[PDB]
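#struct-pred
JK: can someone run the complex with chloride ion? inputs below
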Amino acid sequence: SDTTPCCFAYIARPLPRAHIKEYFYTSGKCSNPAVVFVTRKNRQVCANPEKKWVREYINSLEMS
Amino acid sequence: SSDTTPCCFAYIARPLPRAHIKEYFYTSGKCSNPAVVFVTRKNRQVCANPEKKWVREYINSLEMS
Amino acid sequence: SSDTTPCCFAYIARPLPRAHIKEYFYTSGKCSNPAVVFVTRKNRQVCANPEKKWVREYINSLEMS
Amino acid sequence: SDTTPCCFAYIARPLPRAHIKEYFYTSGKCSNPAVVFVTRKNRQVCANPEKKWVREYINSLEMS
Amino acid sequence: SSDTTPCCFAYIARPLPRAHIKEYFYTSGKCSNPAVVFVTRKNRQVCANPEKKWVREYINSLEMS
Amino acid sequence: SSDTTPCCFAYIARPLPRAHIKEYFYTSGKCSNPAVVFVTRKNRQVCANPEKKWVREYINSLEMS
Ligand SMILES: [Cl-]
Ligand SMILES: [Cl-]
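RT: done, structure tokens with the ligand placed:
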């Protein structure tokens, strides 16, 4: 019965890659699929998982 | 600072100990399910059924303080 | 000292308890969706649909003393 | 629901960097993308994310 | 000398209820947009388009009732 | 509640007495002119020139307390 974070819209402009510390996917219970990027200062930004830059960011976060 | 929205997909079964609650809110209308969230003193966010008697009474207790 | 504008992108379904509401406001015409915001005694703010009968009745009750 | 803070205009003049405590990106639900700077005394100022000074302020906050 | 003056940058599309309005004024001609402001019994202020028929009817009623 | 936006069309000529100031804000970017508003203890809203040295120093005083 914990809340889970869901996204209902996406930032259009990519945020700076160097500011991003980690990412996660929102729960599949959520009505929309989403990636959440977490900044060094713990801003959380919803992103569209079908966008090329979101995929490049995730790939970079995971393999470097 | 965060543009995620907390949503609920289950309601807690046992009423929370009243003394552990410090605030409540209603989840956004964007969420698929309507819900009450009770925020505990340890800052757990607990989903609860808005129709339940004990939930309405807790909220009433917090608002009419 | 904020020049952000509070907007609503969804509404709560069930009327919240009348006795908890301290004031309302209409959101700005800048917002893409028209809305009412109810403010509770403890400053929860709840987005509500201006076309719903219960919303219009709550507003009326707050405006007529 | 809860309200979403949106920006419908931006401050032209950069505000003093030393007064700024934090920033956030407005929600993707908003019609106009924006940055909000929050001062030590909780003034909130709408700013244009494409402006260099805005990007540099954000970078300074994230990389500090 | 240098008081602020209220300006409107958008208008409420839905006419607000006529019975809630206690007075109106025009924003300053210095403002970039022309506007009527309706003031409710509870001192809510609502920007309105002075070219709209319902705004004129409201003003006429407020002046000649 | 307040659909209107406070805008400035003139800047006060004489620096306000610092002790009379309670807060400041920057006016909305919607306004045609950029401005600082000092809020006095009596709750007067005074428009002031953002480029003026004394204005920037008052603001700095208020933020850096
Ligand atoms: Cl997108
Ligand atoms: Cl209109």
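RT: quick notes.
Residues E 11, 13, 49, 52 surround chloride ion (ligand 2) (CB under 6 Å).
Residues 53-63 of chain B form the longest helix (11 residues).
JK: thanks, will look after standup
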